[PDB]
Design a protein around this nucleic acid. Structure first.
Ligand code: ZN
Lengths: 87, 87, 136, 99, 96, 100, 244
RNA sequence: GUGAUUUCGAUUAACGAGAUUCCCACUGUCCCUAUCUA
């Protein structure tokens, strides 16, 4: 059905913080390719010392359109934990 | 349908196909065999570094299917003379 | 290879018969391209003409702008889902089927192409090569 | 006609820079390019061109130019050498590096 | 080094891993011919000299081979030699 | 030529072998065989599939970081051809594979 | 030094060749007429390399660089990288980049001191440009056109952009580049100008269909003749007005 | 003799192994065949 007018590279990346803070994550996960990581950001410095941040979370985050629904649900759980931390 | 020059579509009289024309002889050249016998032993693939001026694949490498024919040396065991006749 | 192409074109597996709708990958304002004919197509009885990567077809715009609709125009196929063999040794394929509008001389109507363009199409059409951002 | 005047400007107008500080951006012309003698198409003693070499050897479509002849190497005998690339499932170029 | 070229330094013969299917290894002289020929494996074949002096540049051009595929033909072969297969997989249970 | 490695299981990909998929974001996934290609299309996780080098290195079946393993990378800066350098490379490759 | 030629009867010299001040890259295909056309003017002064990029001939579109360095896409093979390295002198850096926008000639419009790049390229390739080519990177769309390298031919002396460029865009780009700019055509009215012609500070090559007025404009902006300054617009003006 | 009912000879909801033109979805009907089991 064609391509977007404002989309040149057909590449959509946002911030893991933007994912954490957005209210509707379903459409974002549908229309994102990657979640970039900043190691000089204090929120990410906080979230680096968590149980689910390490292991295969980074590999599942570096790409999105190869993931399965189980990987996506794990990502949703990680964002949920990050949200909870945030007379 | 079909190429009418390959009729009739009958079984070959032998398993070894006959050579029905040898190269035209040139008496000045040294003595050489015109033909050899081998056994077909499978196929494989090669990468050829092509040198073919004029081609779009000049100075480029292509992948080719090849056939391997097992050819141990043949043993000479006889000689037969032929005379030409009006028949 | 018709008029406008650069040199000889080798055989590539056919993916897009007549009556197929592909994406339009340029910024000309078309959304799809419906194939009505394939240029340089040898005739065989009871066979649908089909197009491959690097081919020039004649297409209408089923979805797009009202000005661009209703008119048969030349297009060039730049992506095919059907896998084809590259002579250096790879079988490869793209995610969808995509083409770009063009004039009879092979010049691109739009300004740029979005997505990867087939290497064969880019090396055959210099204007496609000029307007490509990603070539495989 | 005054209406045609507005269309002239877009093509005839040439815009200069504002010189943006003292950063020097001078045109580079090589000394060999400077001292190169102009090629005269009808001149007896002129350098032999690549198409001339092709015509002398085979002509277009049959001549086979050696692309290793203009290689700049520490040794000239190395120009006609095969560079290996596969060894036991490894790419040689991957292991190729100084020290 | 039947299957080794100037570009591929792996010392290996022409025989693919596991042998040709329905035909053993090649331990004699052999002819590698471009393309396919009539017949199937094990069939006796006759190779004849060209009947005419070929006027094609194809008959003249030298062949420089870069690599010969010696992967197994008995499946989706990934390794050219058993040494490469072992170096990839590593140490298996029966190696210890 | 170039020996690639499978995007799924990391097994070597030789000329003609396997299949390549080019995604719209223009990155190329090379698969050594249709097994890996079909698992990718099914969207299975190689890090979960025990028969892949990704899983093995993730779970500790084999070493992921090593002095021998640092020798081979994709060189993006070419070096001038030097016969002595090539011969030294050919020796060192065998030595390194033995040590590994 | 403005000359005309064709590659296999094609007018797009910028597609099939790359010209800088210290080297020239020429597609290998066909015969040696194109190579010898370059060599007749250039002499043995600078390297002229028959090169192939990923098995293709579109090297002025797949490759980017200037007198200092050369950039090739990820699709470039090791053999081609080695061939380029053995051909060019060590004074030329040669770098292969992992950029998703592979058509470096299209996505980078550069010269010896400043690069105009595609807006959406990444910081990694911007840093690579600034490091290997020794230039300053600017994300800018020429008249709102993707592929600045395709729609603009640039040099240390001047620049030719596609005619649709607005006057404000011309002024802004001229200030960012510090070379005089002209909106103009090539190859009898072709908008794609960088991909239609190669140019460096002392030579320009364009398709055989380049008309005399277009050739004069090109030679004026690129300052090929020593005697003619940037001010000859006041002397070509009558011809240009009569043409348009 | 007409065949529900209503409204203005026309009109009418519900229903139909009744008739006709298209749409989505789907596909070996087809391009163009190929293979497996009994
Ligand atoms: Zn697998």
């Amino acid at each position: 059905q064609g391509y977007e007018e404002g989309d040149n590279l057909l590449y959509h990346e946002t911030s893991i913080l933007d994912f954490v803070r957005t209210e509707d994550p379903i459409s974002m996960l549908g229309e994102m390719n990657k979640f970039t990581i900043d190691e000089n950001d204090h929120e990410w410095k906080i979230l680096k010392k968590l149980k689910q941040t390490t292991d295969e979370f980074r590999s599942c985050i570096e790409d999105l359109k190869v993931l399965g629904k189980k990987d996506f649900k794990m990502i949703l759980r990680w964002r949920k934990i990050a949200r909870e931390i945030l007379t | 349908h079909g190429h009418l020059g390959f009729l009739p579509r009958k079984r070959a009289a032998s398993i070894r196909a006959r050579v029905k024309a040898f190269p035209k002889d040139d008496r000045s050249k040294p003595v050489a065999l015109t033909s050899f016998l081998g056994y077909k032993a499978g196929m494989t693939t090669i990468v050829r570094d092509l040198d073919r001026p004029g081609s779009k694949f000049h100075k480029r490498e292509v992948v080719e299917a090849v056939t391997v024919v097992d050819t141990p040396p043949v043993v000479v065991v006889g000689v037969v003379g032929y005379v030409e006749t009006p028949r | 290879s018709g008029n406008g192409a650069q040199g000889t074109k080798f055989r590539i597996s056919l993916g897009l018969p007549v009556g197929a709708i592909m994406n339009c990958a340029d910024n000309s304002g078309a959304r799809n391209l419906y194939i009505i004919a394939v240029k340089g197509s040898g005739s065989r009885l009871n066979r649908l003409p089909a197009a491959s990567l690097g081919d020039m077809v004649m297409a209408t715009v089923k979805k797009g702008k009202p000005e661009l609709r209703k008119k048969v125009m030349p297009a060039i196929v730049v992506r095919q889902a059907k896998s084809w063999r590259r002579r250096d040794g790879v079988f490869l394929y793209f995610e969808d089927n995509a083409g770009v509008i063009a004039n009879p001389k092979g010049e691109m109507k739009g300004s740029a192409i979005t997505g990867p363009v087939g290497k064969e199409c880019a090396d055959l059409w210099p204007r496609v090569a000029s307007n490509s951002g990603v070539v495989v | 006609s005054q209406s045609r005047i507005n269309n002239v400007l877009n093509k005839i107008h040439v815009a200069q820079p504002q010189a943006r500080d003292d950063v020097k951006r001078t045109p580079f012309i090589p000394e060999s390019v400077k001292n190169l003698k102009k090629y005269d198409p009808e001149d007896p003693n002129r350098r032999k061109l690549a198409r001339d070499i092709e015509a002398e050897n085979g002509g277009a479509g049959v001549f086979n130019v050696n692309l290793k002849d203009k290689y700049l190497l520490e040794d000239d005998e190395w120009k006609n050498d095969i560079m290996p690339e596969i060894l036991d499932g490894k790419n040689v170029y991957d292991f190729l590096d100084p020290e | 080094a039947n299957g080794a070229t100037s570009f591929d330094r792996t010392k290996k013969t022409i025989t693919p891993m596991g042998g040709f299917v329905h035909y053993g290894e090649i331990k004699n002289d052999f002819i590698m011919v471009k393309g396919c020929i009539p017949g199937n494996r094990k069939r006796i074949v006759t190779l004849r000299k060209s009947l005419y002096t070929n006027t094609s540049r194809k008959a003249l051009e030298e062949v420089s081979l870069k690599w010969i595929d010696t992967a197994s033909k008995f499946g989706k072969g990934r390794f050219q030699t058993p040494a490469e297969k072992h170096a990839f997989m590593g140490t298996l249970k029966k190696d210890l | 030529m170039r020996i690639y490695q499978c995007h799924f299981c990391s097994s070597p990909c030789y000329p003609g072998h396997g299949i390549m998929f080019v995604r719209n974001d223009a990155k190329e996934f090379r698969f050594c065989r249709s097994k890996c290609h079909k698992a990718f299309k099914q969207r299975r996780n190689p890090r979960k599939l025990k028969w892949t080098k990704a899983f093995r290195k993730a779970a500790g079946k084999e070493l992921a970081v090593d002095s021998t393993l640092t020798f081979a990378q994709r060189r993006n800066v070419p070096v001038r051809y030097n016969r002595e350098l090539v011969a030294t490379t050919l020796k060192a490759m065998a030595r390194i594979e033995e040590i590994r | 030094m403005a000359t005309r030629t064709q590659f296999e009867n094609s007018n797009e010299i910028g597609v099939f060749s790359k010209l800088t001040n210290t080297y020239c890259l020429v597609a290998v295909g066909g015969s040696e007429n194109f190579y010898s056309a370059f060599e007749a003017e250039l002499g043995d002064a600078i390297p002229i390399v028959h090169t192939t990029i990923a098995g293709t001939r579109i090297i002025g579109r797949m490759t980017a660089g200037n007198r200092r360095g050369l950039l090739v896409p990820t699709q470039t093979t090791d053999q081609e990288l080695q061939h380029l390295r053995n051909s060019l002198p060590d004074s030329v850096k040669i770098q292969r980049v992992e950029e998703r926008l592979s058509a470096l000639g299209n996505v980078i419009c550069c010269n010896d001191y400043v690069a105009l790049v595609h807006p959406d390229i990444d910081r990694e390739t911007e840093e690579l440009i600034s490091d290997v080519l020794g230039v300053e990177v600017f994300r800018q769309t020429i008249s709102g056109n993707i592929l600045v390298g395709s729609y603009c031919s640039l040099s240390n002396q001047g620049g030719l952009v596609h005619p649709q460029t607005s006057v404000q865009d011309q002024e802004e780009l001229s200030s960012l580049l510090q070379v005089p700019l002209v909106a103009g055509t090539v190859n009898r009215g072709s908008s794609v100008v960088g991909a239609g012609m190669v140019v460096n500070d002392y030579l320009a090559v364009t398709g055989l269909d380049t008309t005399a007025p277009e050739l004069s404009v090109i030679e004026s902006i690129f300052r090929l003749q020593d005697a003619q300054p940037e001010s000859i617009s006041g002397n070509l003006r009558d011809t240009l007005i009569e043409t348009y």
